[PDB]
Each structure stands twice: as C-alpha cells, then as structure tokens.
C-alpha cells in the first residue's frame with residue numbers, strides 16, 4: 001500500500017529469482033556429505049583445476065548478483081559510472097553473505113558441487129587463511145538465522161551504499177539507499193526481528209574480507225586466467241583489466 005511495502009515485494013522478488021538454489025533444497029542436502037574418498041579426490045586435484053572450478057562458481061555467483069542489482073528499483077536509472085562503482089565494490093560482499101545459506105554451522109560444512117563439505121576440500125588452492133575467514137564469516141552470519149527476506153533487503157543495502165568513493169550522482173544513490181533503509185527497518189518491525197540489527201556484521205569486516213578475497217582472486221587470474229562471458233562488460237573490463 002505505502003509504496004515502501006511495494007519496494008519490499010520488488011526486492012524480495014528480485015532476490016527469489018536471482019537465487020541459484022532454494023533454501024529448502026540447501027537445507028535437505030545437509031545429510032548428503034562428501035566422503036573422505038571424494039574429499040581426497042578434491043585435495044589430490046591440481047591447484048589450477050580447483051581454481052578453474054571455484055572461479056566459475058564465483059563468476060556465476062557474481063552474475064546472479066549483477067542480475068539482482070539490475071532487477072532493483074531505480075538501479076538502471078543510475079549512470080554507468082555509479083553502476084560500476086557500486087557493483088565493483090559490493091557484488092562480492094553480497095556473494096559472501098548469500099554464502100551463509102549454503103553453510104551448515106553443526107558440521108561446519110558448505111554445499112559445494114552437489115554435496116556438503118569442510119574447508120579441507122579446498123587444500124589444493126593453498127590459501128587456507130582466506131578460506132578459514134570466509135567459513136568464519138559464514139559461521140557468524142549463520143547465528144543470525146537470517147530469513148530469505150532479511151538476506152534480500154540486507155544484500156540490496158550492501159550493494160546500494162552512497163559512501164562508495166567515485167560516485168558521480170551521490171545524491172541519486174542516497175535516495176535509493178534511504179528507501180531501502182526504510183524498507184528493511186519497516187520489514188524488521190512488522191516481523192519483530194529488529195534484534196538482528198545489533199547482531200549484523202560491522203561494515204569494515206565485510207569490506208576487509210572481500211578485499212582479501214578479491215586480492216587472492218586477482219592473483220590467481222594473473223597466473224591461470226579463466227574466461228567469462230560478461231553480463232556487465234564495463235565492470236569486466238574494469239576488474240579483469
């Protein structure tokens with residue numbers, strides 16, 4: 001009715017559509033866990049075979065976030081520079097948050113290539129400090145027992161941030177940010193879930209995790225470059241140089 005309630009449906013639709021899997025499908029598969037036979041298979045793989053697999057799962061992940069951003073109200077009406085600046089900075093932060101859905105805090109596993117498995121599965125990659133942080137972030141986000149609308153509005157907020165450096169129409173972004181802040185506050189009140197606001201991770205934590213992540217990603221792309229069919233080419237030319 002109040003148009004903010006409309007935006008809540010809009011942002012929840014976008015997220016529902018741009019989701020790879022469904023929460024119940026990820027929840028039921030918690031039983032189907034990789035055997036040591038299969039874990040060893042992964043550990044034994046080349047660093048580069050594992051890098052190719054992981055790189056494509058990540059480019060796929062980013063492509064759904066790019067589609068989610070496209071489906072957000074008034075995102076296209078922004079200038080390409082602002083679309084770049086927002087997406088370059090936040091798309092992977094959204095991927096990191098989205099990841100807590102495929103993470104099981106009981107066995108400390110993640111749903112990868114059809115089954116749930118631990119961080120050891122990634123030994124071949126040789127970046128244990130980073131993988132542990134990723135798994136640690138997802139373990140803290142797991143505690144919030146985030147609902148699907150809660151992840152939707154939060155990730156839309158992660159993306160839409162007027163504080164990003166390099167915005168040419170900061171004011172046009174602030175207007176989008178503030179409606180989403182209302183949408184999220186409103187929704188949280190309606191459902192008696194505002195308690196999560198205090199439990200939400202600090203902005204700096206997320207940006208630090210992401211930067212480390214994108215650095216190891218940029219390092220591997222220099223060594224063993226993968227090829228991706230760009231959903232947003234001016235972003236691709238920016239990230240992949």
Ligand SMILES: O=C(O)[C@@H]1CCN(c2nn(C(=O)c3c(Cl)cccc3C3CC3)c3cccc(F)c23)C[C@H]1O
Nearest residue numbers: 058059062088091092217221230231232235236239
């Ligand atoms: O248009 C598309 O389909 C592209 C998908 C990959 N993508 C993005 N990749 N990306 C990466 O860290 C990444 C990934 Cl995931 C896989 C391989 C190599 C890299 C590093 C060289 C950058 C990023 C980080 C932060 C924000 C983003 F957008 C992207 C750009 C998009 O334009």
